[PDB]
């Protein structure tokens, strides 16, 4: 429906707005004003029905958004790109069959090795741009503009934290699914079943097992075995928060001897274990609304025709775009029934944030100030430690 109210027609006449005085290279330079009415609007007072309304305050609601990981954050010093480690595989000893000829003691036996070569990290970048012309047409005082410029900076150093948090949980759920081949998955059957099966799996960390690790995709550890235990000061279990809620209201509640058997200190959790996405099929960008949707999240640098490599991530709901269906797959657990247990010092997280802020760039020919943020993160999973998945497969 429409409205025949004349001041509603005044609001609807967007030709006299300030937006038309910046899109075009020329404009009007004088204003005659207009008779503003308040009557038959949502803007009446009782006494003075001819004044433009007033705003008394804004408050700039901001939340600080931590990391939940940065005791993992050790700092290399940005030199070199390839790092690796390695183990020696086991050799079961052999019986003394003395019938063999004595000159085999001249023949040699080199020890065997399995390495895992990692490679470079990745550098993350974002821009933001403080204007001096459009943005101060708001902000009835300058103090609100200063709090605005401070708060956009504080939230653009909080978003990097929530970003690397969700892509860490992305990376180890992806390692939980596409790696960790056949033995160390365990099929539960219910939301209480894996509650028992997790400390079934706890105390399987601490037997000397050639299983439970991921040596069989190393360099030289394709054929052979390798045994490693854990220490229980080192194990990290993760799951949905609903699972640890069911733990903390059911088993440590309705039982009676929980003086020692409570493993809940090593339980980190999340609300949902997927908002993240993985590229397949190596598409390109074709459609306008796709990159317009990318502009809503800060992704400015991609245009139409720009390719996407298969190893990238997208960290928010992007698969609903028409150009990504079939190409893009969500890293998520299958059944909302998830418990991935490992040990710490099996994940490697290592970032470089020393030269983090860059000097600001002042653009006088449109009067803005632009800031960049750079940091060099690296993360991987070392495959030489005991890990167990529990889902419904």
């Amino acid at each position: 429906q429409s409205t025949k109210n004349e001041t509603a027609l005044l609001v609807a006449k967007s030709a006299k707005s300030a937006l038309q005085d910046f899109n075009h290279d020329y404009s009007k330079s004088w204003t005659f004003g207009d008779k503003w009415d308040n009557s038959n609007t949502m803007f009446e007072t009782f006494v003075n029905k001819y004044l433009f309304p007033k705003i008394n305050e804004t408050l700039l609601i901001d939340i600080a958004l931590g990391n939940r990981f940065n005791w993992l954050a050790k700092e290399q010093d940005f030199i070199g790109q390839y790092s690796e480690e390695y183990v020696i595989m086991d050799t079961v000893p052999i019986n003394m069959d003395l019938s063999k000829n004595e000159e085999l003691m001249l023949k040699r036996n080199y020890p065997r090795m399995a390495t895992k070569l990692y490679g470079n990290g990745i550098v993350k970048k974002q821009k933001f741009t403080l204007n001096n012309n459009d943005t101060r047409f708001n902000f009835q005082t300058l103090a609100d503009a200063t709090n605005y410029a401070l708060g956009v900076y504080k939230k653009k150093i909080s978003d990097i934290n929530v970003l690397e948090e969700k892509e860490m949980r992305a990376m180890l759920v992806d390692y939980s699914l596409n790696q960790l081949s056949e033995t160390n998955v365990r099929k539960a059957t219910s939301k209480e079943d894996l509650a028992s099966k997790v400390f079934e799996a706890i105390l399987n960390l601490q037997n000397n097992s050639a299983k439970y690790n991921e040596v069989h995709r190393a360099s030289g550890g394709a054929i052979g075995q390798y045994t490693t235990v854990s220490k229980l000061k080192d194990i990290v279990i993760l799951t949905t928060d609903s699972l640890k809620s069911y733990l903390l209201d059911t088993k440590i509640a309705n039982t009676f001897q929980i003086a020692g058997i409570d493993f809940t200190d090593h339980v980190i959790s999340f609300d949902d274990l997927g908002g993240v996405f993985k590229v397949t099929k190596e598409f390109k960008l074709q459609n306008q609304d796709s990159i317009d949707f990318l502009r809503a999240y800060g992704d400015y640098q991609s245009q139409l025709g720009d390719t996407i490599p298969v190893g990238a991530v997208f960290t928010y709901d992007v698969s609903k775009l028409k150009e990504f269906t079939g190409n893009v797959e969500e890293i998520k657990p299958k059944s909302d029934l998830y418990a991935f247990i490992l040990d710490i010092n099996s994940i490697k997280y290592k970032r470089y944030t020393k030269g983090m802020l860059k000097p600001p760039f002042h653009n006088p020919e449109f009067d803005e100030v632009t800031h960049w943020i750079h940091y060099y993160s690296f993360k991987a999973i070392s495959p030489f430690f005991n890990k167990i998945l529990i889902t419904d497969q």
Binding site: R68, W71, N147, I157, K354
Partner: protein, 55 residues
């Protein structure tokens, strides 16, 4: 090791530390005081500090 004059304006001074500042935080705490349903055996519902975020 070679000296010459290592100090020029930028990129002669960037390959060292280059102003470590503004660390990505757990200064406000997560998974400890946050993600904490481990509250005491209470006595009443006394109060909750209404914070006015102003900037």
């Amino acid at each position: 090791m070679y000296e010459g004059n290592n100090m020029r304006s930028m990129m002669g001074t960037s390959y060292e530390d280059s102003r470590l500042n503004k660390r990505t935080e757990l200064n406000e705490n997560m998974s400890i005081d946050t993600n904490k349903s481990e509250d005491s055996y209470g006595v009443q519902i006394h109060s909750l500090s209404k914070q006015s975020f102003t900037g």
